[PDB]
Homo-oligomer: A and B are copies of this chain.
Amino acid sequence: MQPLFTQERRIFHKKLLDGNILATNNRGVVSNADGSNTRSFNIAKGIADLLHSETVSERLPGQTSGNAFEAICSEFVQSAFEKLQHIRPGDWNVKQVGSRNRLEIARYQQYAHLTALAKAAEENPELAAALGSDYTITPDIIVTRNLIADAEINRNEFLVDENIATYASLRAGNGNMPLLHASISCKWTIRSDRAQNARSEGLNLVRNRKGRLPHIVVVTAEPTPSRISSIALGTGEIDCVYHFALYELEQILQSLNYEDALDLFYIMVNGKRLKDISDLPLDLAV
C-alpha cells in the first residue's frame, strides 16, 4: 500500500474535504482562496483539483475553518509523530490548546516562571506597570514531553541516583513540570498583517525561555507564495513554515506560469523556510 506518512497526508486532506473546510462555492471560488484575487483563485482551484475536491458548498465562516484546520493539523501531527518513537522516544502528548486559552505555556518547564510574574503583577499594581511582562503565549497546538523516572534513565545502566544530576530537566520530581517540545501555529489562510502574530509568539518563546527553545513552526493552507512569504521569509522567530499541500502548490505554479510566484516558492523551499505538511513529524524528531 501507501507509506504510512502518505496515508496520514491523505487522511489530513480527506478531513478538510469531508468537513467542507476545503470546498468550492457555486461561483467557482475555492474556500482557501482570496475570491477577489485572480492569482489566489487560480492557485487554489488547481490545488483543489489536485486533491480531487468535488463538493460544492458555501465557504465556512472563518472561525469555523480556523478551528477545524487546527484540530485536523493536530490529529495529523499526533498520529504521524507517534511512529517516530525509535528516532525520538518520549512520553509525548499533542494538544490543540484553542483560540480562547491563555497562560498555557506557564504550564511547561521552560516558561513556568511566568506564573510567578503574573501573580506578582496582579498583587502589586506598581510592579504591574513597572513590569515589561509579555506572558501572553497562546499556541494553537502544543507538543509536550513528560518527565522520566530513574527506572527509564537507568534502563540499561546505573546512571543516576538522588545525589547526582539533581537539576536535569527530564527528571521527574521536586515539582518539575512537563517540557514544551513544540508550538505549532495554524493559518487556514493568510493576510500579511494577521500573519505577524506568529512572529511575536515565536519572539516571546525565544526571549522568555529557561532551557532549550521548543520547535516553533507554522502550518498554512494559504495558496499564494507572496502571503506565505510574509510569515516564511526571515529568521529568528519561526523555525520553518509547512504548507498543507506543497507538492500540489508546486505543480500548479508550474502549469500557470506565474513565474515570479514560482521563483518566490523556490526561494522559500530551497531557502529552508517552507516545507510540506509531511515533513513536520520528522522535523519534530531532530
Binding site for B on A (CB under 8 A): 1, 3-6, 9, 83-84, 86-90, 109-110, 113, 115-117, 120, 124-136, 145, 148, 152-161, 163-171, 179, 192-197, 199-200, 203, 206-213, 215, 229-230, 233-236, 239-240, 263-264, 266-273, 275-276, 278-279, 281-283, 285-286
Please tell me if the beta carbons of B236 and A160 are within 8 angstroms of each other in the complex. no
User: What residues of chain B lie closer than 8 Å to A279, measured between beta carbons?
Assistant: 165-169
Please tell me if the beta carbons of B160 and A3 are within 8 angstroms of each other in the complex. yes
Please tell me if the beta carbons of A132 and B286 are within 8 angstroms of each other in the complex. no
Please tell me if the beta carbons of A282 and B170 are within 8 angstroms of each other in the complex. yes
Please tell me if the beta carbons of A130 and B271 are within 8 angstroms of each other in the complex. yes
User: What residues of chain B lie closer than 8 Å to A164, measured between beta carbons?
Assistant: 3, 5-6, 9, 276, 278
| A128 CB, nearest partner CB in chain B, Å | 5
Please tell me if the beta carbons of A113 and B134 are within 8 angstroms of each other in the complex. no
User: What residues of chain B lie closer than 8 Å to A126, measured between beta carbons?
Assistant: 116, 270
| A232 CB, nearest partner CB in chain B, Å | 8
Please tell me if the beta carbons of A3 and B213 are within 8 angstroms of each other in the complex. no
User: What residues of chain B lie closer than 8 Å to A88, measured between beta carbons?
Assistant: 89
Please tell me if the beta carbons of A113 and B89 are within 8 angstroms of each other in the complex. no
Please tell me if the beta carbons of B236 and A207 are within 8 angstroms of each other in the complex. yes
Kindly list the 9 A-B residue pairs having the minimum CB-CB distance in the complex, ordered from nearest: A116-B130, A129-B271, A168-B282, A210-B272, A167-B275, A133-B234, A196-B197, A207-B236, A213-B213
User: What residues of chain B lie closer than 8 Å to A125, measured between beta carbons?
Assistant: 263, 266-267, 270
Please tell me if the beta carbons of A159 and B4 are within 8 angstroms of each other in the complex. yes
User: What residues of chain B lie closer than 8 Å to A145, measured between beta carbons?
Assistant: 286
User: Looking at the complex, which one of B153, B192, B239, B282 makes contact with A165 (CB distance below 8 Å)?
Assistant: B282
User: What residues of chain B lie closer than 8 Å to A263, measured between beta carbons?
Assistant: 125
| A78 CB, nearest partner CB in chain B, Å | 15
Please tell me if the beta carbons of B159 and A130 are within 8 angstroms of each other in the complex. no
